[PDB]
Amino acid sequence: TATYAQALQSVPETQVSQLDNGLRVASEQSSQPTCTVGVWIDAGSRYESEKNNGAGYFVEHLAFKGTKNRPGNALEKEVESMGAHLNAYSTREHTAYYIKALSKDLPKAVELLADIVQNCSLEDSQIEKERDVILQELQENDTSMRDVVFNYLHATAFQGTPLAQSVEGPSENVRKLSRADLTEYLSRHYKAPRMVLAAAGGLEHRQLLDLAQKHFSGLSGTYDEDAVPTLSPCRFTGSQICHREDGLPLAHVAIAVEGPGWAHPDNVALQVANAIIGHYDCTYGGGAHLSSPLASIAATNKLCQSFQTFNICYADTGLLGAHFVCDHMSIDDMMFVLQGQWMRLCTSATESEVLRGKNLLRNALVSHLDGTTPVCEDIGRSLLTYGRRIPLAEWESRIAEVDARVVREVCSKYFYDQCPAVAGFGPIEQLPDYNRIRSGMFWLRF
Amino acid sequence: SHTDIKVPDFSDYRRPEVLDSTKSSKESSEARKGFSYLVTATTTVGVAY
Amino acid sequence: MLTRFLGPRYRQLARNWVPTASLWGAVGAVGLVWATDWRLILDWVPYINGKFK
Amino acid sequence: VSASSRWLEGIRKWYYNAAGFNKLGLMRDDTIHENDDVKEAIRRLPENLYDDRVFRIKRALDLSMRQQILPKEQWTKYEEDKSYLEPYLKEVIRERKEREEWAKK
Amino acid sequence: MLSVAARSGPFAPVLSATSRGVAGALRPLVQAAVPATSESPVLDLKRSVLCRESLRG
Amino acid sequence: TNIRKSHPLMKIVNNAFIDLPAPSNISSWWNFGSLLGICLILQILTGLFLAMHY
Amino acid sequence: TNIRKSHPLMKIVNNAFIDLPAPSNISSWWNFGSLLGICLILQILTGLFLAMHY
Amino acid sequence: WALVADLLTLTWIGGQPVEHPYITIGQLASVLYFLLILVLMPTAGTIENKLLKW
Amino acid sequence: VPPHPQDLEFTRLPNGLVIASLENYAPASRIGLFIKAGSRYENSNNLGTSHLLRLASSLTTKGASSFKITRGIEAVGGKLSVTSTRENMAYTVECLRDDVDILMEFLLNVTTAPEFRRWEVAALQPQLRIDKAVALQNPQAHVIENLHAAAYRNALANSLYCPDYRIGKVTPVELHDYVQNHFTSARMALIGLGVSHPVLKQVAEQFLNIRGGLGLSGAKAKYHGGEIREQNGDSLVHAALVAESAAIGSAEANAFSVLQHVLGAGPHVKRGSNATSSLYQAVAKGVHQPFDVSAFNASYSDSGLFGFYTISQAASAGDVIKAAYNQVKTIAQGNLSNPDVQAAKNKLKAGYLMSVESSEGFLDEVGSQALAAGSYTPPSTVLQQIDAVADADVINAAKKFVSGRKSMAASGNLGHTPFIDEL
Amino acid sequence: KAVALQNPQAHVIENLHAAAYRNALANSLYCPDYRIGKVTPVELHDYVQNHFTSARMALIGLGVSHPVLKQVAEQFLNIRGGLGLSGAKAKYHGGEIREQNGDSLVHAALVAESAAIGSAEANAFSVLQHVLGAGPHVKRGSNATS
Ligand SMILES: COC1=C(OC)C(=O)C(C/C=C(\C)CCC=C(C)C)=C(C)C1=O
Ligand SMILES: COC1=C(OC)C(=O)C(C/C=C(\C)CCC=C(C)C)=C(C)C1=O
């Protein structure tokens, strides 16, 4: 049989083409009877000002509700009738609209995607209906303690920059954003050099290219004009937001140092180090015996309900750290053990646990790129962020290079003696003071 | 509606090399800790004497 | 009997802590020399000279 | 079938009688030092063996206070001495040494 | 087409060593958070939503 | 609720000298600990009254 | 689980001098308590070195 | 009990002048003090373990 | 430009065990052992035993300790999972290609050599409570458990989760007895993705030759009918209405599958009106507040349950149930267009093809097929099987639901939720 | 609730009434678990003000005079601002409720709709109850006429 090493070579190359307006069109072909197609746009809340914050989110609500060719429910009627799935998401940096469909349905699926992007018929009555829907969604998101702390951590880490803003916007923006605000956003941002037609599945690249010229070519043939549109770095702070609510039964805490952006090679080693610390929740089988010292100590001594490590990437910055959920009498112990692990990895990381993290990352990467949809997302996202698709064999090369020395170097660079951003929500009396969290970021013994 | 929470302006209290929100703090990071640790380093030297 | 602490990980862990343990010795040597005014060592030090000539 | 293994057994029986925990109705495994390996082995013991052990130790600590000893008929015979803790203890030692082998890598 | 959860409706639970517990199938609550005020009590002596072993390069 | 059990000073006395669980069991060889304390205060008390004139 | 928090001696130090919840609030007039302690050990230390020759 | 009696031996020698029989037997008692604690008592414990099939 | 893909290979051994494998040339391998060991095989003396079993997979085996299973799997970045239906348990195992042997060894140990040590079993009992608590945070879990308890006398009435009174009370013997009478050759399937067929066949012949157990897909499930009601005041009422339908891999089951997509399963568009969902439009007509409706379709070895599931406001529940039930009645009366069956056929076909896109969905489909049918049915003959469903068949499935003795479970403020006789 | 529900009879007869009725008589004597902590001062006030009224009350006294009671009633028990009937009428439904225990013993009750209190038919039920057999009459007896 093939090895793991051989198996990565046998993964077929992503084919890339540029259309004349600057729309990139990209496809990974497999043998599958189904596909995923979609448009990834370099647009999100980081591009929005104070006054139009939440516009893209508003557009996301309007994108599927009618076009100039397919008014009202006509689009969803066509998607439903062929058994397709039409989906969307919005982050701080990326918007996506994608269709899960039969491979024989890729002609119509590309035709619909173009119709959504170019020809959004934002009828005044529809934008009024969506006002109340988004407002209710804000009330819903208030009850998710995870979503609140991560919004809080962004709001404090990126303090006075566009990365501080939520995707959905404030409620005053939701109730006063006009159609003209929305079309101005669409005009400025939905432009061909900034968006990617991605596909994965049972398709030739040739026909993906054909359909791209067929349906997308009226986008930026002479629309390459106005201030097109530089992002600018976001100042990370080192600060604390503490929403004390003793009426909630569990504390949420998220803590992060400033990460580097999408581009940086340091991400691979940081991800290895994050894998060593890992994740946990209360439904994990066998707690005491888990490899991660944090996960093991948390399970045995009932220190939390869950934790997760993360490395959120933006352009030229990010959030590197962890989040947890615990009882009111446990925040101090959780924070102690978390910080000790960061410190341990900076100073005294060893060969064996780094192998375990390396292996966890190969297993995560490969297990993630499994299905037409995650592969299509990855084609789309990667061309926005790296400008290539980075093939699986390259990641393996980048993973393999990481050893204990790299983990000690790269963790020290971002973690050791750095100011964290801290976000606390719930019963947080026992959340350590910021000075004492700052003091947890170095070791007196080292 | 938790999305109505902005962190208030801290310009009044900020170190001068950290007032530009358009510019990275990582650059002034070594300097700012440098100044504050030099204070404690000199104090320890002073107390040591 | 101490054989628990002998293997590749503890060899790496000792190697990591060696520059630190060396520097903590270097801290303590100078600190002893400074506290006692250790005449033997401080005669070498080209500007610290309380004894004339 | 050995004269010499009968001899070692007779030195062992001699030592057993000299040790004199059997005089208080104790078994050997009642007298073991409670370290972390041993505390866990005790934790792992089934209901009946647990409850027998506490009473034997109760009876011994009672006698040791009175500075008295059981009637000879009621001393635990060396041949009747059940090694009831040992298999659990071996397993607890076996599990720890596996952990310690993993901590080495 | 022989599989109860792929038929989409009846209930399946998953346990693991490294990954969060899962429940269930196709009962509705995807066109139910769409007309809104389904708050759903999200985070009260409770596991993690969305699952994690799905990390990037 | 006992005065002996909850008063912040008597707490210390109770958990050392009164309610402290001790073996049924300990012989005359365990008497020497208290005897060392008696010795300590005897030497303190006489030593004080000698210091008054030395 | 912290060494500072559970060691029977350091427990006492931690619950008095480190983790002790104190008002955000107390002014310079609250400095005199520690100053009395400093005074106490200053007088003990000098008093000892005077007793060596008196 | 060899340790107690050897200690009793050493306090007897301590009481005597540094002359003929006393120099050697005090040297042997010194050696026995350190040999009992370091070597002979740990070995006794192992033998006792082996005799109980432990 | 991909490689020309390998065919799946499939083997029934004389002892009844089924081995199926696919060499996708993938970086990772997936291996599952599928066992007819789900909750339906419990009885009234051992309820919850298959729950504790589902939680017990990293307890000590013969030459692999609890510590070793956790550490060894994690050292190579692997997973071990156990998923259960009312019919099956499924022990699956993932790693990179190079690491199959160690994870296979852990798998075989877990499934054929568990020790169920008294104290390990004891330390695990509280985990039933945590696991049940987390699962039962979704109101759907309460409803569908109560739905099955209401519907059946027997077997399929059993919960996926341990009854509260049994927590702390399931024994090492009951676990041993459960494995020894259910985890046997003629009740097992060994499926592997990214392994060779000779390696799997070899593993099966060396390590999976057990029998001293039961034979059938069980004591046969007796459909009873009835209703279970749980007062909450949860702001929302969850209700499910159901009748006996068709056993899995009968032709009639496909008719139920298609009717499910006429009436409407899940949504297709993020935030959409569900235009071609006939239940959703029917409720929407006379109800002007937040609701949901889906068709519900659960097919088993020897029975099925078809109908619908509603979420609505407490005061609206009666109206939502009656609008939904009338919409089914209207298809039973024959008002069903050829284009509507065809769209439902398109959703079902595409749904199924998307279902098997990933390794996880492929392996579970191949595993359950091997247990239900004794066979592997490729995608295109499933599609052929769906195509053969006549319009009359879908009318006939709706007729069967409307005329058949009902089962109902509901939870919420039930002050305006109807009983079965009020419908 | 915990103390009361230690008798298996309490579970059974509560479930029996819940099974039997749509309505009214289906309600438990004991608070549903989800309501514990959730019943309010307003709900208590509203309950007293619509049920504790003159036309819903009786004042009975043993070893008191009738003039004293009559006086007490006329001075202190003249309330109305409440409901009228013996209620929303109880709808008999029928059905079964099943609670798995393994309690060594099974408690079962089988029941049908009978007769309203102080109808002639209720006396027929009362007599049939003693044909079939109510409680025992003899300590440790065989219950010969039961
Ligand atoms: C658990 O064992 C204990 C004993 O049982 C054998 C004692 O008898 C005593 C009594 C000791 C006294 C009176 C000396 C106190 C010393 C000072 C410096 C005040 C103590 C404290 C003890 O802990
Ligand atoms: C809750 O308020 C407290 C303070 O806040 C104003 C203090 O500053 C101090 C510090 C006191 C010291 C160093 C004196 C110790 C005395 C002796 C005899 C060793 C203490 C104990 C205290 O309780």
Separation of G5 CA from ligand 2 center, angstroms?
A: 19
Q: Choose among I250, I320, I323, I260: nearest CA to I292.
A: I320
Q: Which amino acid is at A366?
A: V
**Residue I96 sits in the same domain as residue I175:** yes
* Upper half-sphere CA count for residue I80 (Cβ side, 13 Å): 32
Q: What's phi and psi for I193, nearest 5 deg?
A: -105, 125
Structure's resolution in angstroms: 2.6
Angstrom CA distances, D11 to A125, I1, I180, stand at 102, 82, 48
Check CB contact of E43 with chain I, cutoff 8 Å.
no
How far apart are the C-alpha atoms of I305 and I52, rounded to whole Å? 26
Helices A266-277 and A404-414, packing angle to 10 deg? 100
E1-57 CATH fold: Cytochrome Bc1 Complex; Chain I (2.10.210)
Provide the number of structural domains found in chain C.
1
- Ligand 2, atom 5, residue with closest C-alpha: G30
For F21, other C-beta atoms within 10 Å of its C-beta total 4
Helices (H) and strands (E) in chain G, counts: 3, 0
* Upper half-sphere CA count for residue I327 (Cβ side, 13 Å): 26
Residue A69 near residue A119, CB atoms below 8 Å: yes
3 state SS of F44: helix
Residue A430 near residue A329, CB atoms below 8 Å: yes
Q: Do A297 and G1 touch (CB under 8 A)?
A: yes
Q: Which amino acid is at A288?
A: A
How far apart are the C-alpha atoms of A295 and A200, rounded to whole Å? 37
Smallest CA–CA separation between A7 and chain G, in Å?
A: 45
How far apart are the C-alpha atoms of B28 and B36, rounded to whole Å? 13
Token pair belonging to A335: 């924070």
Residues of A taking part in catalysis: 60
Q: Residues with Cβ < 8 Å from G47, sequence gap 6 or more?
A: none
**Residue I346 sits in the same domain as residue I209:** no
Chain D residues closer than 8 Å to C7 by CB: 103-105
**Sheet containing I18-22: order of strands:** E22-23, E13-16, I79-84, I89-96, I28-35, I188-193, I18-22, I9-12
How far apart are the C-alpha atoms of D49 and D56, rounded to whole Å? 11
Nearest ligand to the C-alpha atom of residue F38: 1
**Residue I292 sits in the same domain as residue I182:** no
* Domain ranges across chain A: 14-227, 239-442
Task: Say which of J34, J101, J102 has its CB closest to residue I231.
Answer: J34
E-strand stretches of A389-434: 421-426
Residue A294 zone, left/alpha/beta (φ > 0; ψ -120 to 50; rest): alpha
Q: Dihedral, CA atoms, I367, I372, I375, I376, nearest 10 degrees? A: -50
Chain D residues closer than 8 Å to I67 by CB: 95, 98-99, 102
Q: Do D62 and F24 touch (CB under 8 A)?
A: yes
How far apart are the C-alpha atoms of A419 and A439, rounded to whole Å? 9
Residue A422 near residue A373, CB atoms below 8 Å: no
- Ligand 1, atom 14, residue with closest C-alpha: F37
3 state SS of J91: coil
What would you report as the CA-atom Rg of chain H, rounded to the nearest whole angstrom?
15
Q: Own/partner pairs for A294-297, CB < 8 Å, 24+ apart?
A: A294/A337, A294/A338, A294/A341, A297/A337, A297/G1
Tokens 């509203």 sit on residue: J46
Angstrom CA distances, A7 to A13, A218, I191, stand at 13, 41, 20
Check CB contact of F24 with chain D, cutoff 8 Å.
yes
Residue A328 near residue A427, CB atoms below 8 Å: yes
Longest dimension (CA), chain I: 64
Q: Residues with Cβ < 8 Å from A359, sequence gap 6 or more?
A: I75, I76, I77, I96
Task: Say which of A146, A285, A398 has its CB closest to residue E57.
Answer: A398
Token pair belonging to J54: 């003159």
3 state SS of J125: helix
Name all residues whose Cβ lies below 6 A of ligand 2.
G 16, 20, 22, 30, 33-34, 37, 40
Residue A420 near residue A254, CB atoms below 8 Å: no
Q: Which amino acid is at I302?
A: D
SS (H, E, C) I173-235: HHHHHHHHHHCCHHHEEEEEECCCHHHHHHHHHHHCCCCCCCCCCCCCCCECCEEEEEECCCC
Atom of ligand 1 nearest to the CA of F26: 6
Angstrom CA distances, I295 to D30, I240, I354, stand at 66, 9, 19
How far apart are the C-alpha atoms of E47 and D96, rounded to whole Å? 31
- The H or E element containing residue D80 is none
For I173, other C-beta atoms within 10 Å of its C-beta total 11
Residue I189 near residue I201, CB atoms below 8 Å: no
Chains within contact range of chain H (3+ C-beta pairs < 8 Å): D
Nearest ligand to the C-alpha atom of residue G13: 2
Q: Do A155 and B33 touch (CB under 8 A)?
A: no
What are the helix (H) ranges across A14-86? Answer: 55-62, 74-81
Q: Choose among I228, I280, I243, I164: nearest CA to I411.
A: I228
Q: What's phi and psi for A300, nearest 5 deg?
A: -70, -45
**Residue C21 belongs to a domain with what CATH number?**
1.20.5.220
Q: Do chains B and G touch (3 or more CB pairs under 8 A)?
A: no
Provide the number of structural domains found in chain I.
2
Q: How was this structure determined?
A: X-ray
Strand partners, I409: I228, I240
Q: Which amino acid is at J1?
A: K
Q: Choose among I83, I81, I84, I80: nearest CA to I71.
A: I80
The domain of D77 spans 1-105
Q: Residues with Cβ < 8 Å from C38, sequence gap 6 or more?
A: C32
Token pair belonging to A98: 């994608």
How far apart are the C-alpha atoms of C7 and C12, rounded to whole Å? 9
3 state SS of J24: helix
Q: Residues with Cβ < 8 Å from A39, sequence gap 6 or more?
A: A96, A97, A98, A113, A116, A117, A195, A196, A197, A198, A380
Taking CA atoms, what residue in E is nearest to I143? E27
Provide the number of structural domains found in chain B.
1
Token pair belonging to E9: 């409706």
Q: Which amino acid is at J108?
A: A
Atom of ligand 2 nearest to the CA of G36: 14
Angstrom CA distances, I360 to B18, E52, I18, I90, stand at 50, 15, 19, 12
How far apart are the C-alpha atoms of A39 and J73, rounded to whole Å? 81
Strand partners, I304: I299
How far apart are the C-alpha atoms of A355 and A360, rounded to whole Å? 9
Chain I residues closer than 8 Å to E18 by CB: 73-74, 79-80
**Residue I166 sits in the same domain as residue I254:** no
Token pair belonging to I396: 């006939």
Select the residue from J98, J100, J101 to test the I interface by mutation, using most I Cβ atoms within 10 A.
J100
Q: Do chains J and F touch (3 or more CB pairs under 8 A)?
A: no
Pairing of strands A421-426, A240-244: parallel
For A43, other C-beta atoms within 10 Å of its C-beta total 27
Check CB contact of A301 with chain G, cutoff 8 Å.
yes
Taking CA atoms, what residue in A is nearest to E21? A283
How far apart are the C-alpha atoms of C19 and A193, rounded to whole Å? 52
Query: What are the b/e assignments for I385-398, b being 16+ CB within 10 Å?
Result: bbeebeeebbbbbb
How far apart are the C-alpha atoms of E20 and D71, rounded to whole Å? 61
Judged on CB neighbours under 10 Å (0-12, 13-18, 19+), G5 is middle
For F54, other C-beta atoms within 10 Å of its C-beta total 6
Cα angle at A190 between A189 and A194, to 5 degrees?
A: 80
Q: Dihedral, CA atoms, C22, C24, C29, C31, nearest 10 degrees? A: 160
- Ligand 1, atom 18, residue with closest C-alpha: F37
Nearest ligand to the C-alpha atom of residue F18: 1
Task: Say which of B5, B18, B29 has its CB closest to residue A155.
Answer: B5
Asked whether the CA dihedral A240, A241, A246, A248 is positive or negative, the reply is: negative
Token pair belonging to D39: 């505390």
Chain F residues closer than 8 Å to D62 by CB: 24
Q: Residues with Cβ < 8 Å from C4, sequence gap 6 or more?
A: D100, D103
Strand partners, A25: A17, A197
How far apart are the C-alpha atoms of G44 and G52, rounded to whole Å? 12
Helices I391-403 and I338-355, packing angle to 10 deg? 90
Taking CA atoms, what residue in A is nearest to C16? A348
**Residue D99 belongs to a domain with what CATH number?**
1.10.1090.10
Check CB contact of F25 with chain D, cutoff 8 Å.
yes
For A35, other C-beta atoms within 10 Å of its C-beta total 30
Task: Say which of I44, I226, I232 has its CB closest to residue J34.
Answer: I232
3 state SS of I411: strand
3 state SS of G7: coil
Q: Residues with Cβ < 8 Å from A260, sequence gap 6 or more?
A: A266, A267, A316, A317, A318, A414
Those of residues 32-51 in A touching chain I at CB distance below 8 A are 32-34
Q: Choose among B33, I92, C32, D42: nearest CA to A416.
A: B33
Q: Choose among J70, J47, J51: nearest CA to J60.
A: J70
Nearest ligand to the C-alpha atom of residue G30: 2
Select the residue from I76, I81, I109, I250 to test the E interface by mutation, using most E Cβ atoms within 10 A.
I81
DSSP B17: G
Residue E40 near residue I278, CB atoms below 8 Å: no
Query: What are the b/e assignments for E37-56, b being 16+ CB within 10 Å?
Result: ebeeeebeebbbeeebbebb
The domain of C5 spans 1-53
A14-227 CATH fold: Cytochrome Bc1 Complex; Chain A, domain 1 (3.30.830)
Taking CA atoms, what residue in I is nearest to D42? I119
End-to-end CA distance of chain D, in Å?
46
Token pair belonging to A80: 């439903």
Residue I253 near residue I302, CB atoms below 8 Å: no
Architecture of domain A239-442: 2-Layer Sandwich (3.30)
Q: Residues with Cβ < 8 Å from C20, sequence gap 6 or more?
A: A347, A445, A446
3 state SS of H27: helix
Select the residue from A301, A336, A430, A435 to test the G interface by mutation, using most G Cβ atoms within 10 A.
A336
Token pair belonging to D16: 């057993």
For G22, other C-beta atoms within 10 Å of its C-beta total 7
Q: Own/partner pairs for A387-390, CB < 8 Å, 24+ apart?
A: A388/A16, A389/A14, A389/A16, A389/A26, A389/A28, A390/E57
Token pair belonging to I184: 């046997």
Q: Do A350 and C9 touch (CB under 8 A)?
A: yes
DSSP D75: S
For residue F47 and ligand 1, the question of a CB distance below 6 A is answered with no
Domain boundary among I219, I244, I278: I219
Q: Do chains J and A touch (3 or more CB pairs under 8 A)?
A: no
**Residue I384 belongs to a domain with what CATH number?**
3.30.830.10
The domain of I70 spans 1-219
**Residue I304 sits in the same domain as residue I364:** yes
How far apart are the C-alpha atoms of C17 and A347, rounded to whole Å? 8
Separation of J92 CA from ligand 2 center, angstroms?
A: 75
Taking CA atoms, what residue in I is nearest to J31? I231
Check CB contact of B30 with chain A, cutoff 8 Å.
no
Separation of G24 CA from ligand 2 center, angstroms?
A: 16
Residue I286 near residue I319, CB atoms below 8 Å: yes
Strand partners, A306: A281, A325
Angstrom CA distances, I165 to I45, I162, I169, J18, J100, stand at 12, 8, 8, 22, 8
Q: Choose among I292, I133, I236, I316: nearest CA to E29.
A: I292
Chain F residues closer than 8 Å to D61 by CB: 23-25
Chain A residues closer than 8 Å to G1 by CB: 297, 301, 333
How far apart are the C-alpha atoms of A271 and A320, rounded to whole Å? 10
Helices A351-368 and C8-36, packing angle to 10 deg? 130
Chains within contact range of chain A (3+ C-beta pairs < 8 Å): B, C, E, G, I
Asked whether the CA dihedral A171, A172, A178, A184 is positive or negative, the reply is: negative
Smallest CA–CA separation between D13 and chain F, in Å?
A: 28
Token pair belonging to D88: 């659990």
Chain B residues closer than 8 Å to A156 by CB: 7
How far apart are the C-alpha atoms of A117 and G49, rounded to whole Å? 88
- The H or E element containing residue J104 is none
Q: Choose among A328, A281, A278, A286: nearest CA to A306.
A: A281
Chain A residues closer than 8 Å to C12 by CB: 350-351, 404
